Amino acid sequence: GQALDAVRMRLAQLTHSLRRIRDEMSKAELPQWYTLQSQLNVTLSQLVSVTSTLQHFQETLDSTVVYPLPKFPTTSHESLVTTLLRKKNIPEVDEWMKYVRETSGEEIEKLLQQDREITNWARTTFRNEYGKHDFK
Amino acid sequence: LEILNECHDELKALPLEQVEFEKNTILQQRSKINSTELLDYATKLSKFTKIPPTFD
Amino acid sequence: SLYPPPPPYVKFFTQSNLEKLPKYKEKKAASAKEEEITCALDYLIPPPMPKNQQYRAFGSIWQENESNYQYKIQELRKLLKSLLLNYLELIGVLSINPDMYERKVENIRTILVNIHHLLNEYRQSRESLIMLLEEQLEYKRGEIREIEQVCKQVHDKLTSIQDTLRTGS
Amino acid sequence: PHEIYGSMPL
Amino acid sequence: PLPTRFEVELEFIQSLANIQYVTYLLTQQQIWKSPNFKNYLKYLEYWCNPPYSQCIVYPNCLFILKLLNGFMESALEGLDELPKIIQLQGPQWMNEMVERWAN
Amino acid sequence: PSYSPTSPSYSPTSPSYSPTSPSYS
Amino acid sequence: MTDRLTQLQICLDQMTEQFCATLNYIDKNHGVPPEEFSNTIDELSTDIILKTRQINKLIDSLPGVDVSAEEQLRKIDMLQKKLVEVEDEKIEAIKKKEKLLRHVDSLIEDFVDGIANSKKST
Questions:
Q1: How many CB atoms lie within 10 A of CB C66?
Q2: Residue whose C-alpha is closest to residue A36's, from A58, A47, A20, A12
Q3: Could you name the domain of life of the organism this protein comes from (chain F)?
Q4: Cα distances (angstroms) measured from residue C150 to each of B11, B20, B31, E36, E80
């Protein structure tokens, strides 16, 4: 419950930041560019923290089993239950990665290791380039 | 003059031409359609539109 | 799936087919002077009504001034009296020898079933037309009569005012 | 069409 | 036996009255994208006159297709609002259907 | 305490994307 | 108002329900004191008789119960005819009422102009 509690508080503050950026964008007059950058960076790094913390506690979330309350009436709130129950993605993202995979399209493994060696080589090359010139 | 003015206003409130076009439209609509098809369609919808009291 | 697929011919008719339909039907009429599907444009031609004027669906069949009933009344009255008499005889059967009571039960039901048949010929759409007829007729008469009443009272008030102003002259 | 125009109060 | 095209088109028209069917049909992209389906929808318009209208089982779809007719110049967008709007506008649309027929 | 609660952001108008297919018997 | 055919269906349904209840009482009560049972059954039989007499007085009170539908056809046709003439007469009635109405309006305007130019004449 502790992990889900931390997820709750962090997601609540993320939703609060979203409500903020919403009600300062809803104005008919656009504020200064710099305030928009500050709000963007803060909210976006907060989203990063959301992702990282959700990553950290996957085991606690998975272990939990969902069950409706005995006191909760489904006869009158079945629509509300179904609203939270449904999880299928929005369609546009679906065909989005479908076209993405269409465009992308032992052989695969050796290309994978070739990518490994290119990555390592590029990292070493840029380390050497940084070391070549004194930046301090 | 005031009271006859509200008498004029209330008489004008009760309707002129619009009522007679509406009555006309009623008359050609009734004349165009035959009663046999209307009664058949009413009988066929009597089961669906009218909810029986014994339908749980 | 839950939802059956669209009809197949739906996909055959594009905008080009719609715009070329007039010349196609003109050519078809000129040539002509169950319909075989020799061209993709045949479906837009209105389908012909079946000669039998019948339509079958789900195992069921389907196909003037409003645009001795006393015999039926007395038959219904005697049937009701006989139904009450048979109910009395059946409950007496239940009283004395109920083991064969069902032997009469369905019999009574038949009479009840006959009553339903007696309703079928009496079927009521014209009666509903009549009742709606008189209700809107009386409503429009009420509206009309209140109209002449109110205009007449306004005219009477105007005449009284005219007399009053003439007296003050 | 004119029924609505003639039937509404000012 | 094989049903005639009359039966299948009439059953399609009467099934168009279902909100779930309309939502499912509009869910797929290619159904609305393809002009064939809307061409067939406009072709279906000629059933609002007798004696074809005498063969219908549920008159509500008569407006729905007409409402679907409006959909070709109102936009897909509005698919989400379809159940709410039909539930809200059922009273007045039923009243106007009754005015068209019962009077 | 709590500076401000969150505004109700329910979206019942969302149509949902539940896949329905195993209806035929 | 309630159509008498719907009342007839309600009456027959109530009659069937009353017979079912009476026979259920008989089946579940035969064996209760004889006097109370007899009194209750007398009440039930009086209910049966009364239901029968509303059935009789509703079945014979159906207009058109003893009238052939074709003279209803002519009477309905002539009803729409005389209806056509009655809205026609209402058309002339309303048009002449509007005529006298704007005669009244014209005299109102003339009298108001007379008042205005008289009280500004000094």
A1: 20
A2: A20
A3: Eukaryota
A4: 8, 21, 34, 61, 53
Are B5 and G101 contacting, i.e. CB atoms less than 8 angstroms apart? Answer: no
- Between β-strands C60-62 and C55-57, what pairing exists: parallel, antiparallel or unpaired? antiparallel
Q: Tokens 């006393």 identify what position?
A: C70
Q: Which of E50, E98, E44, E99 is nearest to E68 (CA)?
A: E44
SS3 for chain C is CCCCCCCCHHHHCCHHHHHHHHHHHHHHHHHHCCCCCCCCCCCCCCCCCCCCCCEEECCEEECCCCCCHHHHHHHHHHHHHHHHHHHHHHHHHHHHCHHHCHHHHHHHHHHHHHHHHHHHHHCCHHHHHHHHHHHHHHHHHHHHHHHHHHHHHHHHHHHHHHHHHHHCC
Q: Do C65 and G74 touch (CB under 8 A)?
A: yes
Task: State how far the Cα of C165 lies from the Cα of C153, in Å rounded to an integer.
Answer: 18
CA-based nearest distance G122→chain C, Å = 22
On the 0-12 / 13-18 / 19+ scale of CB atoms within 10 A, G57 is exposed
**Torsion angles phi and psi, residue C62, rounded to 5:** -140, 160
Closest residue of chain B to G105, computed from CA coordinates: B8
Alpha-carbon distance of B42 to B53, in angstroms, equals 19
Q: Which residue has the tokens 């009194």?
A: G39
Nearest one of B47, G75, G85, B31 to C130, comparing CA atoms: G75
The answer to whether the Cβ–Cβ distance between B4 and G98 falls below 8 Å is no
Structure tokens at E99: 């005015």
The helix (H) or strand (E) run that includes residue A51 is helix A33-56
Nearest residue of chain E to residue F19 (CA atoms): E24
Cβ contact B43–C150 (<8 Å): no
Asked if the C-beta of B51 comes within 8 angstroms of chain G's C-beta atoms, the answer is no
F19–E contact, CB cutoff 8 A: no
Q: How far apart are CA A132 and CA A128, in angstroms?
A: 6
| CA A92 to chain CA centroid, nearest Å | 17
C14 phi/psi in degrees, rounded to 5 = -90, -175
D and C interact (at least 3 Cβ pairs within 8 A): no
Cα Rg of chain F, angstroms: 18
Method: cryo-EM
C67 to chain B: closest CA residue = B35
Dihedral angle at the C-alpha atoms of B16, B18, B20, B25, nearest 10 degrees?
180
Residue C55, strand partner residues: C62
| E87 contact partners, CB below 8 Å, separation of at least 6 | none
Contact E37, C10 (CB under 8 A): yes
Q: Confirm or reject contact between A95 and chain E (CB < 8 A).
A: yes
Query: Residue E74 is encoded by which pair of tokens?
Result: 């109102």
Contact predicate C115/C79, CB 8 Å: yes
Q: What angle do CA C7, C16, E5 make, to 5 degrees?
A: 25
